[PDB]
Each structure stands twice: as structure tokens, then as C-alpha cells.
Design a protein around this ligand. Sequence first.
Ligand SMILES: Cc1cc2nc3c(=O)[nH]c(=O)nc-3n(C[C@H](O)[C@H](O)[C@H](O)COP(=O)(O)O)c2cc1C
Length: 169
Amino acid sequence: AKIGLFYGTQTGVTQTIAESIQQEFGGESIVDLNDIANADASDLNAYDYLIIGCPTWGVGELQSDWEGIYDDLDSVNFQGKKVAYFGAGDQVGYSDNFQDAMGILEEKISSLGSQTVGYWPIEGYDFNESKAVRNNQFVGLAIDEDNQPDLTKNRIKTWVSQLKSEFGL
Ligand SMILES: Cc1cc2nc3c(=O)[nH]c(=O)nc-3n(C[C@H](O)[C@H](O)[C@H](O)COP(=O)(O)O)c2cc1C
């Protein structure tokens, strides 16, 4: 596929979201699903369009598989690549660290020469702080199954539609 989606998950939510995103894009012929846990950093080189999925754990911390591969990221060719992000978080229980993981990954990967695409509005959420917010918008799709599970489907639908234009589909 032209789009490589790499996700990490602890309790499975981010994987379900990744599968739904793949489905919304048109399936396996359009998006390849890859669990970062089973990947080498070089695996990301095979795609020119990437989607990075990661839930926030601990207190504003990276999901462990992403945490473990983080230091290998700078060896990857992200030069000029369009990268989109999504994450699972809990805005009620972690209002000061909502979606921090996605923010941490985007800060790192964008500093490696990539172009972030897929910005998302913060208005549909209620939180205090997030490392995933740059000038009043999320750097990617924020999903919250803990507090807003009923909004997930339409958010993915809307975001993928937005991404298609931003990627070139
Ligand atoms: C112990 C614990 C810590 C968490 N820490 C955060 C956090 O700092 N920020 C946040 O947005 N969500 C936080 N969450 C919420 C998770 O990101 C959320 O439950 C998500 O659905 C987990 O996704 P996963 O199943 O892909 O691992 C935490 C949840 C638990 C149970």
C-alpha cells in the first residue's frame, strides 16, 4: 500500500482505531497496518505516506512499544514525507496530559524533516493541557473511548476524508 500505518497499543483501543482507519480509507489495498511492536524502524522507509498511532499512558507517557523504538526514529528517512497522527487518550482522568504521546511523537518526527498533515480541532474536547496541541489545534486525530466512544466513528470518517485530500487520494 502507499500508506503505512504504524500503531502501538496496550489495551487494544489504538489497534481497533487503526483497523477502522484502514477500513475507512478502502482497506488493505490502500493502507497497510503494522504493529510498531513487531517492526524495525527501517520498516517506515517503505512508505512515503505514514500514519502514526499511539495511546498516552502513565502520566503523559508514550505507549511502551513506541517508547522502546523512539531512539531509533532519527535513523529513519522522514525527509519530505507526509505524516499524519492519531491517538487514544482520556480527557477526564488526564486533563493535563491529554494525548501527550501523540504530541511527543509528532514533535520528534516533524523535527526529522517530515511534513505533518491532518491537523484536528480541539473544540470537541474538554481538557486543560496537551503536548499534541500547537496553536489551538491537535496535530492529529484525538480519540477518547473512555469518555466519547460515540464520536469515534464520525471522527474517523471525517478525518480520513480530510487526509485523502492532504495525502493525494
Ligand atoms: C493507568 C492509565 C494511564 C493513562 N494515562 C493517560 C494520559 O496520561 N493521558 C491520556 O490522554 N490518557 C491516558 N490514559 C488513557 C488511555 O490512553 C486510554 O485508556 C486508551 O484508550 C488506551 O489505548 P490502548 O488500548 O491502545 O492502549 C491512561 C489510562 C490508564 C488506565
